[PDB]
Amino acid sequence: QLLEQSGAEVKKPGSSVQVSCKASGGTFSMYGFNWVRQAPGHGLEWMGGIIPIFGTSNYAQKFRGRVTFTADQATSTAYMELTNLRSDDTAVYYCARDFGPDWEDGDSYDGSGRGFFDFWGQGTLVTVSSASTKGPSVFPLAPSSKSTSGGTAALGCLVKDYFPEPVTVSWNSGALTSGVHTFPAVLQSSGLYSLSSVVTVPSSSLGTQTYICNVNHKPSNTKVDKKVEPKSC
Amino acid sequence: ELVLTQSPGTLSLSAGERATLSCRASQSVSSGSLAWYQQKPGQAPRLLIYGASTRATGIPDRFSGSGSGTDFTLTIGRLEPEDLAVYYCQQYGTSPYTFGQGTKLEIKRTVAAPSVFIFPPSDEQLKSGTASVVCLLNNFYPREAKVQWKVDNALQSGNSQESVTEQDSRDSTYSLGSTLTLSKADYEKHKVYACEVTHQGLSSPVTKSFNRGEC
Amino acid sequence: KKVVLGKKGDTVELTCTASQKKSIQFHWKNSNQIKILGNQGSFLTKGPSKLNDRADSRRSLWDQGNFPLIIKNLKIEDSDTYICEVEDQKEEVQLLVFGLTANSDTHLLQGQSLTLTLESPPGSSPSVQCRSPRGKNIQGGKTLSVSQLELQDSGTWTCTVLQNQKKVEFKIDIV
Amino acid sequence: VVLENVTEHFNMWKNDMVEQMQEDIISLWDQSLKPCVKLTPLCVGAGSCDTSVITQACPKISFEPIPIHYCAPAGFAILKCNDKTFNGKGPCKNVSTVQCTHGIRPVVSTQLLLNGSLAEEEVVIRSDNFTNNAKTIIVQLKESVEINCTRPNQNTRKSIHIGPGRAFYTTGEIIGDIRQAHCNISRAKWNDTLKQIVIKLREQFENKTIVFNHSSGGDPEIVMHSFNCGGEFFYCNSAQLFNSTWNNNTEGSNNTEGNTITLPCRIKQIINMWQEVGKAMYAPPIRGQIRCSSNITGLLLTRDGGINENGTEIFRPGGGDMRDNWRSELYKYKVVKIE
Ligand SMILES: *[C@H]1O[C@H](CO[C@@H]2O[C@@H](C)[C@@H](O)[C@@H](O)[C@@H]2O)[C@@H](O)[C@H](O)[C@H]1NC(C)=O
Ligand SMILES: *[C@@H]1O[C@H](CO)[C@@H](O)[C@H](O)[C@H]1NC(C)=O
Ligand SMILES: *[C@@H]1O[C@H](CO)[C@@H](O)[C@H](O)[C@H]1NC(C)=O
Ligand SMILES: *[C@H]1O[C@H](CO)[C@@H](O)[C@H](O)[C@H]1NC(C)=O
Ligand SMILES: OC[C@@H](O)[C@H](O)[C@@H](O)CO
Ligand SMILES: OC[C@@H](O)[C@H](O)[C@@H](O)CO
Ligand SMILES: OC[C@@H](O)[C@H](O)[C@@H](O)CO
Numbered sequence: 001q002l003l004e005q006s007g008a009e010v011k012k013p014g015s016s017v018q019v020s021c022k023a024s025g026g027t028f029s030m031y032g033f034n035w036v037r038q039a040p041g042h043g044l045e046w047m048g049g050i051i052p053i054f055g056t057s058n059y060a061q062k063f064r065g066r067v068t069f070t071a072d073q074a075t076s077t078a079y080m081e082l083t084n085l086r087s088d089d090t091a092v093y094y095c096a097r098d099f100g101p102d103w104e105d106g107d108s109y110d111g112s113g114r115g116f117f118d119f120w121g122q123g124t125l126v127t128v129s130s131a132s133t134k135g136p137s138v139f140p141l142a143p144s145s146k147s148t149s150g151g152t153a154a155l156g157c158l159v160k161d162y163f164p165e166p167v168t169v170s171w172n173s174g175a176l177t178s179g180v181h182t183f184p185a186v187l188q189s190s191g192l193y194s195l196s197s198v199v200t201v202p203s204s205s206l207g208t209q210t211y212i213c214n215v216n217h218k219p220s221n222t223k224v225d226k227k228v229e230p231k232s233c
Numbered sequence: 234e235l236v237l238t239q240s241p242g243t244l245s246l247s248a249g250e251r252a253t254l255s256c257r258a259s260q261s262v263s264s265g266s267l268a269w270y271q272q273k274p275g276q277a278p279r280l281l282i283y284g285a286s287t288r289a290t291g292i293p294d295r296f297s298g299s300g301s302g303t304d305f306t307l308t309i310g311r312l313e314p315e316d317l318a319v320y321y322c323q324q325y326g327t328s329p330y331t332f333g334q335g336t337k338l339e340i341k342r343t344v345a346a347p348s349v350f351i352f353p354p355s356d357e358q359l360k361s362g363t364a365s366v367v368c369l370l371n372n373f374y375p376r377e378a379k380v381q382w383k384v385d386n387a388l389q390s391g392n393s394q395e396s397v398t399e400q401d402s403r404d405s406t407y408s409l410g411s412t413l414t415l416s417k418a419d420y421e422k423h424k425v426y427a428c429e430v431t432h433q434g435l436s437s438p439v440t441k442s443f444n445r446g447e448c
Numbered sequence: 449k450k451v452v453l454g455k456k457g458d459t460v461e462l463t464c465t466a467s468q469k470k471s472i473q474f475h476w477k478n479s480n481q482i483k484i485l486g487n488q489g490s491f492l493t494k495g496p497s498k499l500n501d502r503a504d505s506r507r508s509l510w511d512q513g514n515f516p517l518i519i520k521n522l523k524i525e526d527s528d529t530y531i532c533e534v535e536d537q538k539e540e541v542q543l544l545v546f547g548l549t550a551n552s553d554t555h556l557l558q559g560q561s562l563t564l565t566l567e568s569p570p571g572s573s574p575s576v577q578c579r580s581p582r583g584k585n586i587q588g589g590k591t592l593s594v595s596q597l598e599l600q601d602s603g604t605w606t607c608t609v610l611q612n613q614k615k616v617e618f619k620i621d622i623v
Numbered sequence: 624v625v626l627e628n629v630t631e632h633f634n635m636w637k638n639d640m641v642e643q644m645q646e647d648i649i650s651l652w653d654q655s656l657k658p659c660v661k662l663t664p665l666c667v668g669a670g671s672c673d674t675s676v677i678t679q680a681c682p683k684i685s686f687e688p689i690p691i692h693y694c695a696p697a698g699f700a701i702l703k704c705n706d707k708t709f710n711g712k713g714p715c716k717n718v719s720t721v722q723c724t725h726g727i728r729p730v731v732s733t734q735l736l737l738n739g740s741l742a743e744e745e746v747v748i749r750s751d752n753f754t755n756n757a758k759t760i761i762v763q764l765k766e767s768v769e770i771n772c773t774r775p776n777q778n779t780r781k782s783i784h785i786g787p788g789r790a791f792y793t794t795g796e797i798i799g800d801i802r803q804a805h806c807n808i809s810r811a812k813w814n815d816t817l818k819q820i821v822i823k824l825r826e827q828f829e830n831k832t833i834v835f836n837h838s839s840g841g842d843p844e845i846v847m848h849s850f851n852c853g854g855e856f857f858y859c860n861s862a863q864l865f866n867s868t869w870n871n872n873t874e875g876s877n878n879t880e881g882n883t884i885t886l887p888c889r890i891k892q893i894i895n896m897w898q899e900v901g902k903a904m905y906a907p908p909i910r911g912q913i914r915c916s917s918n919i920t921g922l923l924l925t926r927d928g929g930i931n932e933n934g935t936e937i938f939r940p941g942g943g944d945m946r947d948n949w950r951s952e953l954y955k956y957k958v959v960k961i962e
Contacts, residue, residue, distance in 0.1 A: 027676065027678065029659075029660075029678045030659070030660045030678055030904065034330075036278075036332070043321065043332055043333070043334055043335045044270075044278065044321055044323075044332040044335075045332065046323075046329060046330040046331065046332065053659050053660070053678065054659070054906055054907060056907060058328060059329075060328070060329040060330075061329060061794065062329070064789075064790070065790065094277060094278070096278075099280075099283070101660070101892075101893060101904055102893075103662065103893060103902055106893060107843075107889075107891040107892065107893050108802065108891065108892050108893070109892055109893070109904065110892075110907050111328070114325065115266060115268070115323075115325020115326070115330055116266075116268035116280060116283050116323065116325050117280065118280045118289060120277040120278055120279070121277065122277065123277055139354075139355045139357055139358045139365070140355045140357070141352040141355070141367060142352075142355065144352075144353065144443065144448070145448065146350075146351055146441055146442070146443045147350040147351065147352060147369075148350075149348045149349075149350065149371075154350045154369055154371070156352070156367075156369075158355075158358075158365065158367065158412075160358075160365070181371075181398055181408045181410075182398070183396045183397070183398055183408070183409075183410040184396050184397075184398065185396070186394050186395075186396050188394070188414075194394075194412070195396075196367060196410050196412065198369055198410065200371060231356075231448060233448035263798055326798070327796075327798050328796055328798070471900065473944065475757040477757075477928070480929050480930045480931050481756075481928055481929060481930055482927070482928060482929040482931070483756060483757070483839070483927065483928060486757065487943075488759075488845060488941070488942065488943025488944040489897065489943060489944035489945065489946065490895070490896055490897055490898065490899055490900045490901070490943075491841065491842045491844055491845050491895065491897070491943040491944075492841050492842050493839075493840075493841040493842075493845055493941075493943060494839055494840030494841045495839055495840075495927075496839040496927055496937070496939075500839060500840050507664065507900050507901075508664040508666060508671070508672045508674075508900070509666070509671075509672070510664075510900050511664060511666055511899070511900050512666045512669065512672070533757055
């Protein structure tokens with residue numbers, strides 16, 4: 001809740017992408033700022049970092065002449081730009097803050113920090129594709145007579161047709177978190193993604209409470225709020 | 234170049250007991266510097282233990298580490314339903330800083346029965362273009378589940394799209410949402426829309442069905 | 449003329465306080481007056497002693513006025529009288545540390561005898577008052593051992609050792 | 624041109640002139656050598672304290688040992704004890720009166736005293752109380768021992784190669800010691816000056832055996848000969864320098880053993896502050912070559928006490944409190960009211 005990154009986006013092959021990392025917690029200058037990307041389903045891969053207070057930066061050999069770690073101490077934000085993007089570059093890039101100088105035993109702090117990172121960022125998914133971004137259409141999954149097993153009722157939202165991932169869905173702006181189930185997105189035969197968010201709540205509370213899902217899609221800069229309620233009947 | 238391998242690849246244990254993880258290294262780590270990470274489903278990695286032995290602040294007494302040169306092991310104490318996460322080991326003695334392959338820690342629980350719910354396409358979607366029916370399968374443990382869509386007692390496959398969530402951090406159960414998508418042309422023509430669920434712990438094939446254009 | 453007791457193994461702290469609220473030079477020595485720990489303005493200097501490996505002092509309190517003296521992984525061989533050289537004064541403090549060792553098996557049989565011998569520094573007169581898991585007082589002197597035991601005493605135990613009007617307690621598990 | 628006929632008292636340990644000088648060196652240090660990060664014990668409210676962090680710009684400029692003259696203000700005068708062999712504290716026999724103090728080179732170092740005043744007569748050792756082992760012993764040398772500490776430069780790689788699909792000479796890793804340095808002194812000159820220390824030490828403590836050992840322990844600043852030149856903080860190991868037993872060795876002719884001794888030194892970023900209790904963080908070493916040369920005009924020692932007998936009195940390198948560094952120069956000085 002103190003180290004946050006920018007928004008997810010899509011970039012056509014060959015172009016360059018820049019990811020920011022706003023450090024708003026305590027100190028920014030002396031702590032190193034490394035970047036470790038992670039492909040969907042795969043493992044973590046360290047790219048490189050930078051020490052704002054010294055201007056020093058150490059990176060991985062695999063990214064020669066592609067990464068340019070910069071730091072703006074005025075906004076206390078760490079940046080990272082990757083040039084010549086390919087299909088393998090599609091990953092969720094994480095911004096990790098280095099542990100810091102070892103004061104009671106260590107006698108040095110060079111390159112991109114000590115090595116390990118304690119504070120981590122939200123992570124931004126940069127998808128590399130030629131296809132253009134598409135805003136998601138939200139459809140209500142209203143409660144019915146055949147959707148209530150006992151004293152509990154079930155409703156949700158259908159986030160349909162959007163590109164690319166991901167989509168953040170919350171309920172009642174965050175007030176309703178218990179019982180919420182958000183399914184991982186699946187690619188349709190049209191080349192678009194789709195997911196559904198459902199939450200289980202008491203049947204008697206259906207009238208005494210209004211449920212609204214907040215679908216967020218940063219790639220297209222779209223946020224839709226759909227209030228789900230029983231059919232007209 | 235220093236590569237690391239983690240054993241096992243996948244571990245499914247119950248709650249209350251202890252868990253054992255291992256990180257094998259290609260070469261000897263400089264000054265003996267190793268870091269462990271915990272990453273819950275759809276979240277960001279968390280520093281567990283650094284320096285192979287030293288414990289990070291906030292981390293319970295359950296997690297413990299021990300290792301030398303290439304033999305490195307992380308031992309999770311009294312397991313919990315929330316402890317489900319993929320674990321990684323990272324060395325920081327020599328560049329480039331390399332991470333381990335990763336170990337998926339799943340949690341074992343008692344057989345749980347899934348509750349089924351069916352969701353008819355919304356009027357907003359219908360009078361617009363396409364239609365979509367959703368079959369909800371609330372909490373259950375056995376991940377292996379079969380969903381069958383029957384349009385007027387007739388089975389249909391290859392047109393349904395399914396996706397399951399990872400284990401819940403409180404009860405260790407899964408949740409499946411199968412969405413059958415088809416155009417409006419093939420919707421109003423049929424009257425019966427049923428979703429049959431087959432589960433390895435579910436007595437009789439429970440089927441939920443609704444009528445078209447009905448409350 | 450100060451008395452400070454200590455458990456074997458556990459860390460302990462020896463105090464030294466000056467009238468001035470600044471940070472002047474101070475030095476710690478034993479009864480034989482061998483350098484243990486000291487300071488050179490803003491630096492911590494360790495002396496050629498057996499405590500050298502397990503002795504330190506929190507530098508934070510220095511500028512406030514007082515200068516501590518901690519001893520980790522405490523051992524009975526460390527029992528000695530210490531002094532502090534500050535403001536041309538000699539703050540003397542006697543450290544008497546004790547320990548407990550169980551000779552009998554950790555898993556005792558049904559109706560046996562418990563044997564407990566306490567580690568004492570050369571030239572000392574210890575006094576121990578133990579207590580049972582539920583309700584029974586045990587007294588002794590050099591060595592404390594109970595001959596008659598029952599199965600009901602299976603659990604946590606509490607023994608207190610008193611010396612120079614100061615007492616410290618020990619906990620041991622007997623099944 | 625007055626001539627008072629009185630027994631003039633003198634001291635160097637309870638001298639305000641030393642503590643006053645200290646305040647000015649710290650002030651000169653703060654406007655010359657600035658850390659990029661400073662950690663200080665925020666001790667407010669008796670109860671245990673916390674740490675205070677401050678981040679600031681740190682330029683890598685050199686702190687030059689600019690000569691300092693403590694001159695006497697209007698209405699005051701400073702007395703200079705011109706005794707050939709003074710013990711530090713007590714009554715001085717011959718003492719003149721100059722207006723300004725001799726050129727003192729502001730050198731903040733431990734164990735060894737560099738660039739200072741040399742004794743025109745013989746080696747003079749002094750302590751507040753020699754019977755007490757806690758008191759540091761300041762040694763003044765008449766023969767200048769030149770010490771040369773240096774560190775390589777950019778001559779590592781000299782050319783790069785451009786390529787439309789690649790580049791060359793940029794993967795310098797090899798996790799090693801690039802912050803390493805070393806010193807050099809004359810083996811014959813050091814051993815001789817080491818002997819004269821023993822000669823004067825046994826003159827105060829005879830029927831004993833003078834042994835020289837390494838530092839017993841503590842902060843790396845005391846354990847190692849710490850100094851700064853060019854902006855980098857050196858930490859040379861003085862283990863070999865002070866390793867010799869003396870209880871029966873008084874000859875002198877010519878013996879060779881190890882051309883010139885070399886000291887293992889290391890440049891560090893995280894430093895323990897000497898001005899006030901706390902730590903400091905500086906920028907990484909400079910890209911160029913660092914060459915420094917100075918004359919060891921003296922040193923600091925702390926003998927091992929203990930009522931336990933062995934016949935041997937060990938002498939380890941002391942140092943740390945920078946008050947003693949200026950005390951070795953202002954020992955023969957005392958500010959006075961013009962009355
Ligand atoms: C210098 O300091 C000496 C310290 O010796 C100690 O004196 C007292 C404290 C005894 O209890 C014992 O610890 C030591 O013998 C003084 O004895 C001496 O007078 C002081 N100055 C002189 C005259 O040398
Ligand atoms: C230094 O002297 C001490 C005496 O306590 C001894 O233990 C140590 O071995 C000596 N150091 C050397 C040169 O080995
Ligand atoms: C010692 O004095 C010489 C005088 O030329 C100077 O070059 C050198 O830097 C000094 N040593 C120190 C303390 O750096
Ligand atoms: C001093 O002599 C040593 C030989 O042991 C040599 O390695 C070093 O380079 C010399 N120092 C310099 C640079 O004069
Ligand atoms: O480029 C997208 C922006 O970075 C946003 O995510 C803001 O940070 C928050 O609205
Ligand atoms: O208390 C002030 C805060 O620490 C800020 O400096 C953030 O770190 C950056 O906006
Ligand atoms: O990552 C969470 C998002 O930033 C949301 O808080 C939006 O800003 C508002 O729904």
